[PDB]
Design a protein around this nucleic acid. Structure first.
Ligand SMILES: [K+]
Ligand SMILES: [K+]
Ligand SMILES: [K+]
Ligand SMILES: [Mg+2]
Ligand SMILES: [Mg+2]
Ligand SMILES: [Mg+2]
Ligand SMILES: [Mg+2]
Ligand SMILES: [Mg+2]
Ligand SMILES: [Mg+2]
Ligand SMILES: [Mg+2]
Ligand SMILES: [Mg+2]
Ligand SMILES: [Mg+2]
Ligand SMILES: [Mg+2]
Ligand SMILES: [Mg+2]
Ligand SMILES: [Mg+2]
Ligand SMILES: [Mg+2]
Ligand SMILES: [Mg+2]
Ligand code: NA
Length: 63
RNA sequence: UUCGCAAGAGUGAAACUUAAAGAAAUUGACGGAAUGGCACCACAAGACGUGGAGCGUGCGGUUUAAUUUGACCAACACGGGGAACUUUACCAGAUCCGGACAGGAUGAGGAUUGACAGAUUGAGUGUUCUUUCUCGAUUCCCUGAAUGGUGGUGCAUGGCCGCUUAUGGUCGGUGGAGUGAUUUGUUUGGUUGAUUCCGUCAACGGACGAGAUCCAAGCUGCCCAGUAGAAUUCAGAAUUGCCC
RNA sequence: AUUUGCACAAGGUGAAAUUUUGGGCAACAGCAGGUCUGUGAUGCUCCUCAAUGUUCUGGGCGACACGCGCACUACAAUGUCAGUGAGAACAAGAAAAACGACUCGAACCUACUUGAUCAAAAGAGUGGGGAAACCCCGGAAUCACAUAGACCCACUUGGGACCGAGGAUUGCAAUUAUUGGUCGCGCAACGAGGAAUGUCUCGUAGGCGCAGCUCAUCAAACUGUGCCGAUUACGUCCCU
C-alpha cells in the first residue's frame, strides 16, 4: 500500500509552430542566441518571465 | 450333545474379516555368536589441551521494519562468508527499462531526448509539476512475447565436491556347479599396509584398484654464475701488553 | 621359520634401512548428502514498468535475560618488567584501446634521510626494485645474558576485560568506538578448571613467530614457512 499519489511519467509538450515564434521581407530572431561558441548559431536561449536559459549548455542569464 | 469329581476331553459351526499367510533355498544387512587381522578420525603408555574465566568468531534462541539465507561422524573461523557504502540476496523509500522484435495508432504543420530557475523531495535527484528552450525519427502510445532475476524446486538436472571408505576392494569372457536367484574364479595355510605374494585348487585366461607413475625433502655427478659466493696478494686504516 | 617358498627380526653398509619421509592421484557400487548464493550450466514454474529486473539514499546482516561448537589471552617466579646479544625460511610487490607529456610518468612494495634545538603514531622528500638484482648481510621471537638490574608468592609490577579524554591515519562516507598511537580505568572475572571430550609416534606433540590470503582500512581465521624442541609406545582388540 502506498500513501503518496502516483507520479505520472513526463510527457514532452509542444507549440506546433515553435519555429515561427522564434523569428519575425525582413527576418529578426526574437530569441537571443547562445553566446557559448560550442552551441553556436541555431541554438536560442529561452525566454522565461524570470531569466534566459539555453537548452544545450544550460546557461542562465538572470534578469 | 456324550464322557469327567473337577480341570477339562470328544464332536464341532456360523456371522464377520482378510490378499496374503506360509515353505525351502539365494544375496545383502544385522547379532549383548564364533575365527583371523587392522586403525592414535580406537584403546593401552603418555603429552598438550577443550569442558571452568574474560574475550574473538560461527550456530541457535530472543528481539526487530529487517536482524537475507545454505548446511544440524559427514552442520556450527564452513559457503574461501574478516559484510561501513558496493558486495546484498533482507527492510523503508525513490529512479531507469537494460519490454529486443512484430502488429496497430500519433508522427519533421514534429515521434521523442535532456534540462536552468522556483516548488515537490532524503536528494543543489527535470523523479514529478510552472516555464519554456534543447535533441531530432534513435523513441513514445496499445496488444502480443520477450528480457532479466544471489525468485522457487539440489526430491527434475549437468558439472563439481563431500561421504560410505583409508581400508583392500571390484568386474567380465569361456569353462565347471545349481530348475533358479546365484556360485566358482575371488581359496583352507603362511606372508604383506595391501585380493601383496608363495603355495593349493573346476578352472583358466584377462581388466581395473593396490603397487608402479608423479611432486617435494634429505646425500651426490655434470653444468654454471657482472642477479651466488669464496680464497689469496698488494694498498689504506684500527687494536697492540705493565694493567686482573 | 625352514619339506620348500613367500618372508620376518636384530645388526652391518650407508646421507638415508624399509611402501626411505611427506603428499598428490586413486577402482566398482552407491547417498533422493551439498551446491539452482560461481558461471552466458540448466528443465519446469513465479515476478516482469509504483518489478522479485536494475540503480540510488538510508538502515540491517554486528542488535542481547540466554544455550552450544571452534579459537585467542590468562591464572604467574621453568615468571612479569627494563636492558643487551646472537640469530630463519616460505613468500609478495606498480595499470588500461585511460589520463598527462611525447613510445615514457603515476598507482605497488621498500631502503635512506628529515621531521628533530625534543613523545608515539604521523607527515614529507631522495633513491631502488618487474623481483636471486631494491627491500637484503632479509638483525622474527621462542632463546641467551657472571645484566653482579627491579619485583618476592600477593588477585601482586600476574591478567588485561571493560570504560574516559587527546591526537593521527584509510575511505566518497568511521555514529553502532574502522584501525593504529598517548595518558588514564584495572576494584572484570580468573589462583589450573566436575561429569564428559579432541589430536597426536620424530624434527613429531607442544611452544614461537613470519609470509601469503582475504584486503582502500581491519586477523583471535585459513593456506604455507621456518625456529626451540620433548614424554611415551613401537603393543592390543578391552572401548569405538
Ligand atoms: K547348467
Ligand atoms: K563397494
Ligand atoms: K593503554
Ligand atoms: Mg472342547
Ligand atoms: Mg599401529
Ligand atoms: Mg569417517
Ligand atoms: Mg568448518
Ligand atoms: Mg543499498
Ligand atoms: Mg542467475
Ligand atoms: Mg542431492
Ligand atoms: Mg548433483
Ligand atoms: Mg564370487
Ligand atoms: Mg600382518
Ligand atoms: Mg591375505
Ligand atoms: Mg553473518
Ligand atoms: Mg602486566
Ligand atoms: Mg574465513
Ligand atoms: Na533453475
Amino acid at each position: 500500500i502506498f500513501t503518496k499519489p502516483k507520479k505520472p511519467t513526463h510527457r514532452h509538450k509542444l507549440e506546433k509552430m515553435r519555429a515561427l515564434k522564434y523569428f519575425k521581407y525582413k527576418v529578426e530572431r526574437t530569441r537571443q542566441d547562445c553566446p557559448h561558441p560550442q552551441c553556436g548559431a541555431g541554438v536560442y536561449m529561452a525566454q522565461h518571465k524570470d531569466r534566459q536559459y539555453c537548452g544545450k549548455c544550460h546557461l542562465t542569464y538572470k534578469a
